[PDB]
């Protein structure tokens, strides 16, 4: 007891470190600009909707969005328990989590001195700029998460593990592996908990405080879908890259 009991809040139980490492690197290789995203920061010139889409800012997004979706695919490819998933089942997961991961990837690159998010690690955009270029009120949602997540001081592992959790949702329509996908998330979470215990953040209730951000992301996803329908009215479907249409149309 006491001693037996003091083996509480565990750190990553060996296999968990293999998992932590595979994923940390899967995200590290897929995170476009690595250690030099602040250095390789290209501000978008002042040109900026809730629709009434500013095609000049929308064009700059449509440019960079084709590799962005691809990275979100690449990251998933590298995760072995994902690699092992059927043709259909793994396309459903990839469709559902795409925007979540992209928003999360965008939100972590928020700098408060400049009030800017950094799309694909290359382009730094402002609240007005992301809004007016097609995202509308989904921009505020991403920006507000970027402000919120800044206090969390998330690292490369935290992000990688959050991404894996977003990907392994058994609560997506038309899944047949189900429990196979559910247990994949179960393992990844357990590792994420332990890595979080190990990290020892200067924040009380960090683990639940973080897991609640999943709702914010799930909602950034759902609003994007409706915001996409309004873009389709306001467009040309030829402006949309085929990949963007692949993920979002349906």
């Amino acid at each position: 007891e006491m001693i037996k009991s003091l083996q509480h809040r565990p750190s990553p139980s060996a296999e968990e470190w293999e998992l932590i490492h595979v994923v940390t690197e899967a995200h590290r290789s897929t995170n476009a600009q690595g250690s030099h995203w602040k250095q390789k920061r290209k501000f978008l010139p002042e040109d900026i909707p809730d629709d009434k889409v500013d095609l000049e800012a929308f064009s700059e997004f449509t440019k960079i969005i084709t590799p962005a979706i691809t990275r979100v695919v690449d990251f998933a490819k590298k995760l072995p328990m994902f690699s092992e998933l059927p043709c259909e089942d793994q396309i459903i997961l990839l469709k559902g989590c795409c925007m979540e991961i992209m928003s999360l990837r965008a939100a972590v690159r928020y700098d408060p001195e400049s009030e800017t998010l950094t799309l694909s690690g290359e382009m730094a955009v402002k609240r007005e700029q992301l809004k007016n270029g097609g995202l509308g009120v989904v921009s505020d949602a991403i920006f507000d998460l970027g402000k919120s997540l800044s206090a969390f001081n998330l690292d490369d592992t935290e992000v990688a593990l959050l991404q894996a959790v977003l990907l392994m949702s058994s609560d997506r329509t038309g899944l047949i592996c189900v429990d196979k996908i559910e247990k994949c998330q179960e393992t990844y979470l357990l590792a994420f908990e332990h890595y979080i215990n190990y990290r020892k953040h200067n924040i009380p209730h960090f683990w639940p405080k973080l897991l609640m951000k999943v709702t914010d992301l799930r909602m950034i996803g759902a609003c994007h879908a409706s915001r996409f329908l309004h873009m389709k009215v306001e467009c040309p479907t030829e402006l949309f890259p085929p990949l963007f249409l692949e993920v979002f149309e349906d």
Binding site: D171, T173, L189, H205, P208, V214, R218, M219
Partner: protein
């Protein structure tokens, strides 16, 4: 540690929940009105809820009522195969939902909520806690001091995590498995609310006094 007792929370659940027209949409609306009465009772029976300002108590219940009611009926339906059990003793089936057009969101409820609560064998204490975490929402617009609300939510995170580790030491990620049911409820609850306003406007679905009061400005 227990500045939010799981036993006091499980008690609130038991105090309101007992042991186990034709239009399904109307029948669900009837159930909802009756439960809005019981909901406030349950709310007051949750540690520190009644200590918040009276306008805040309203703010919180006006904000989470849908999600709360959804969670409560979804857990009662864990037995109820392929359908949902109402507080009016009535049952609504998947097929009847589709007939009313509402089959899409109904399928979401059965799958993302009932099935998942059933599969994991979610107990009434955890249910109470999740409902309490939903109740204590600091992000609610207009509350005088959200920090008190946020603190109370944090108090539930702690007590629920503690109960999970205690009652289920074999399941080391049960607490996160429970918290991850909340994005599904936030997503579902929002679409159910949309339908509710759509049905409120058409006028053909009869909405009772309390349900109406929720669907209108204060």
């Amino acid at each position: 540690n227990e500045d939010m007792p799981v036993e006091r929370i499980l008690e609130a659940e038991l105090a309101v929940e007992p042991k186990t027209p034709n239009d399904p949409v109307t029948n669900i609306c009837q159930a909802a009105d009756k439960q809005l009465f019981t909901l406030v009772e349950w709310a007051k029976r949750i540690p520190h809820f009644s200590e918040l300002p009276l306008d805040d108590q309203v703010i919180l219940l006006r904000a989470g009522w849908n999600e709360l009611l959804i969670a409560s009926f979804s857990h009662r339906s864990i037995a109820v195969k392929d359908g949902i059990l109402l507080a009016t003793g009535l049952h609504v089936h998947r097929n009847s939902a589709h007939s009313a057009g509402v089959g899409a969101i109904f399928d979401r409820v059965l799958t993302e909520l009932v099935s998942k609560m059933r599969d994991m064998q979610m107990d009434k204490t955890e249910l109470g806690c999740l409902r309490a975490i939903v109740l204590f929402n600091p992000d609610s617009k207009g509350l005088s001091n959200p920090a008190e609300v946020e603190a109370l939510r944090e108090k539930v995170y702690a007590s629920l995590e503690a109960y999970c580790k205690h009652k289920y030491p074999e399941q080391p990620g049960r607490f996160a498995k429970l918290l991850l049911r909340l994005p599904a409820l936030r997503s579902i609850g929002l679409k159910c609310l949309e339908h509710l306003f759509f049905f409120k406007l058409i006028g053909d679905t009869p909405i009772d006094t309390f349900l109406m009061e929720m669907l209108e400005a204060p």
